[PDB]
Scaffold this active site. Structure first.
Site, mmCIF file in Angstrom:
data_model
loop_
_atom_site.group_PDB
_atom_site.id
_atom_site.type_symbol
_atom_site.label_atom_id
_atom_site.label_comp_id
_atom_site.label_asym_id
_atom_site.label_seq_id
_atom_site.Cartn_x
_atom_site.Cartn_y
_atom_site.Cartn_z
ATOM 1 N N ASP B 25 0.829 -1.214 0.000
ATOM 2 C CA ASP B 25 0.000 0.000 0.000
ATOM 3 C C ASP B 25 0.852 1.249 0.000
ATOM 4 O O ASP B 25 1.434 1.675 0.988
ATOM 5 C CB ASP B 25 -0.952 -0.067 1.206
ATOM 6 C CG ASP B 25 -1.958 1.055 1.278
ATOM 7 O OD1 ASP B 25 -1.814 2.079 0.581
ATOM 8 O OD2 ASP B 25 -2.947 0.912 2.031
ATOM 9 N N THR B 26 0.957 1.881 -1.174
ATOM 10 C CA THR B 26 1.856 3.032 -1.271
ATOM 11 C C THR B 26 1.254 4.277 -0.625
ATOM 12 O O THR B 26 1.970 5.265 -0.475
ATOM 13 C CB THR B 26 2.224 3.368 -2.722
ATOM 14 O OG1 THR B 26 1.045 3.566 -3.510
ATOM 15 C CG2 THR B 26 3.018 2.228 -3.344
ATOM 16 N N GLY B 27 -0.020 4.214 -0.264
ATOM 17 C CA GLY B 27 -0.693 5.308 0.424
ATOM 18 C C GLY B 27 -0.456 5.276 1.913
ATOM 19 O O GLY B 27 -0.618 6.285 2.611
HETATM 20 N N1 LIG Z 1 -12.416 1.742 -1.356
HETATM 21 C C1 LIG Z 1 -11.605 2.493 -0.577
HETATM 22 C C2 LIG Z 1 -11.432 2.141 0.797
HETATM 23 C C3 LIG Z 1 -10.557 2.938 1.600
HETATM 24 C C4 LIG Z 1 -9.871 4.071 1.078
HETATM 25 S S1 LIG Z 1 -8.831 4.972 2.187
HETATM 26 O O1 LIG Z 1 -9.085 4.390 3.527
HETATM 27 O O2 LIG Z 1 -9.131 6.401 1.941
HETATM 28 N N2 LIG Z 1 -7.191 4.762 1.837
HETATM 29 C C5 LIG Z 1 -6.448 5.918 1.283
HETATM 30 C C6 LIG Z 1 -5.707 6.741 2.350
HETATM 31 C C7 LIG Z 1 -6.377 7.184 3.530
HETATM 32 C C8 LIG Z 1 -5.670 7.945 4.503
HETATM 33 C C9 LIG Z 1 -4.297 8.274 4.314
HETATM 34 C C10 LIG Z 1 -3.613 7.834 3.142
HETATM 35 C C11 LIG Z 1 -4.332 7.075 2.174
HETATM 36 C C12 LIG Z 1 -6.572 3.428 2.152
HETATM 37 C C13 LIG Z 1 -5.573 2.971 1.061
HETATM 38 N N3 LIG Z 1 -4.211 3.394 1.495
HETATM 39 C C14 LIG Z 1 -4.220 3.676 2.938
HETATM 40 C C15 LIG Z 1 -5.674 3.614 3.452
HETATM 41 N N4 LIG Z 1 -5.919 2.494 4.443
HETATM 42 C C16 LIG Z 1 -5.823 1.050 4.107
HETATM 43 C C17 LIG Z 1 -6.977 0.265 3.525
HETATM 44 C C18 LIG Z 1 -8.320 0.518 3.879
HETATM 45 C C19 LIG Z 1 -9.361 -0.252 3.299
HETATM 46 C C20 LIG Z 1 -9.064 -1.283 2.364
HETATM 47 C C21 LIG Z 1 -7.719 -1.554 2.011
HETATM 48 C C22 LIG Z 1 -6.685 -0.760 2.569
HETATM 49 S S2 LIG Z 1 -6.262 2.963 6.070
HETATM 50 O O3 LIG Z 1 -6.808 1.791 6.751
HETATM 51 O O4 LIG Z 1 -6.798 4.291 6.217
HETATM 52 C C23 LIG Z 1 -4.565 3.073 6.626
HETATM 53 C C24 LIG Z 1 -4.017 4.369 6.803
HETATM 54 C C25 LIG Z 1 -2.676 4.571 7.237
HETATM 55 C C26 LIG Z 1 -1.868 3.432 7.497
HETATM 56 N N5 LIG Z 1 -0.591 3.585 7.917
HETATM 57 C C27 LIG Z 1 -2.421 2.150 7.330
HETATM 58 C C28 LIG Z 1 -3.758 1.945 6.900
HETATM 59 C C29 LIG Z 1 -10.052 4.415 -0.295
HETATM 60 C C30 LIG Z 1 -10.908 3.638 -1.119
#
Ligand SMILES: Nc1ccc(S(=O)(=O)N(Cc2ccccc2)[C@H]2CNC[C@@H]2N(Cc2ccccc2)S(=O)(=O)c2ccc(N)cc2)cc1
Ligand SMILES: [Cl-]
Ligand SMILES: [Cl-]
Ligand SMILES: [Cl-]
EC number: 3.4.23.16
Lengths: 99, 99
Positions: B25-27
């Protein structure tokens, strides 16, 4: 380009006539942007992760440019703390993970 | 490897001698795993997701293998939707985004 992960992989995007900064996020199934107007029909959706869920609006068939590259797909709009480019659009620009 | 994004980029990791499935997860700035036992002392850490900030446990200098590649670094433990490998360890294994 080849983008390092020493820092957040932030890029410039163009959508709805607007330039924005967004995170290239391989963990996100969907693209999610901060509140903005988009054309056309939408329907509600919930997305969630640590911290819980948020309600967003789902717009389909939206044009976006990402780092110079044009693509079309679904965009979710809502109270996200960061603009996210998800896999549904990363695929369209030929983005891969490599190690 | 080269990993395309038409499906979730799920890989096998090894930690504490156990195989698990985790998402690249690059985010995510930081690696976060589902509740599990790790050695040593932990420190408090807040991480923010789309829905807000939550408290997780921070364990430093933990050995983890990701798709066959060795890393030693910080691992967070808490209520994550799925096990996530974030940029702190993706950098260690040489991962880049490419298009
Ligand atoms: N469908 C869908 C579901 C969730 C999202 S998201 O939660 O916004 N989102 C983007 C993001 C949020 C906050 C900061 C940076 C990136 C996800 C993807 N990258 C990180 C984030 N997450 C992981 C995730 C959540 C649901 C399904 C699969 C993975 S998270 O749980 O917020 C997270 C945040 C920071 C860290 N260290 C670990 C995890 C986007 C689309
Ligand atoms: Cl789509
Ligand atoms: Cl492809
Ligand atoms: Cl680390």
């Amino acid at each position: 380009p080849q983008i390092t992960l020493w820092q957040r992989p932030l890029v410039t995007i163009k959508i709805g006539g607007q330039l924005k900064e967004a995170l290239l996020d391989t963990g996100a199934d969907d693209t999610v942007l901060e509140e903005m107007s988009l054309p056309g029909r939408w329907k509600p959706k919930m997305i969630g992760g640590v911290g819980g869920f948020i309600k967003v609006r789902q717009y389909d068939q939206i044009l976006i440019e990402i780092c110079g590259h044009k693509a079309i797909g679904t965009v979710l709009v809502g109270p996200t703390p960061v603009n996210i480019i998800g896999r549904n659009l990363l695929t369209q620009i030929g983005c891969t993970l490599n190690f």
